[PDB]
Design a protein around this nucleic acid. Structure first.
Lengths: 90, 90
DNA sequence: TGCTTATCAATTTGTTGCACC
DNA sequence: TGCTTATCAATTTGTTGCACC
């Protein structure tokens, strides 16, 4: 599924036009994104929670030279799936 | 931000009624859940990917007995953040 | 939900290039 | 928007119990 697919699925289930569904879908993920950008958590009952996490510094490898790379600590978005999601997948 | 806030933000940004925004938000979560239930990833440009991950078996510890726990393999929902989202949060 | 054991194990993640990611 | 390095490092994850709602 890509976003176009999701838009079509939403239009069908919510009984909206394609345009309205597109607007709706763009609005949810822009809104989740903007909330995370402010360090604000997003808690979506029946789905899951997004939050910003502080990731510690770590190491990577350069594939061409084989040299170790320093990866500095950074803020990263994380998602915690709710029970409904976990159950359906399992 | 919670689901109610998300619905409100959706109604405003997408120019939809609350009923419509409500239905759309529900349809988004359900569509994602259903796609994952079938093992198919939901890929959203910029934002990231919701996907199904086969988690290998692992080990834990019982906090009261100190005995090792065999954590079996299972399928779990995972989220892989896209570039626009990673950038906006760092 | 949100924190939580360990004289816990070990899977997982993140790294570049690809003129995009 | 997905593949991708490792004769790669090492953070992270995941475990159960408790205490709230």
């Amino acid at each position: 599924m890509n976003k176009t697919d999701l838009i079509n699925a939403v239009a069908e289930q919510a009984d909206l036009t394609k345009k309205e569904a597109g607007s709706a879908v763009d609005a949810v993920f822009e809104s989740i994104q903007n909330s995370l950008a402010k360090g604000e958590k997003v808690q979506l009952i029946g789905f899951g929670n997004f939050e910003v996490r502080e990731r510690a510094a770590r190491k990577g490898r350069n594939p061409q030279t084989g040299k170790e790379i320093d990866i500095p600590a950074s803020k990263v978005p994380a998602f915690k799936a709710g029970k409904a999601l976990k159950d359906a997948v399992k």
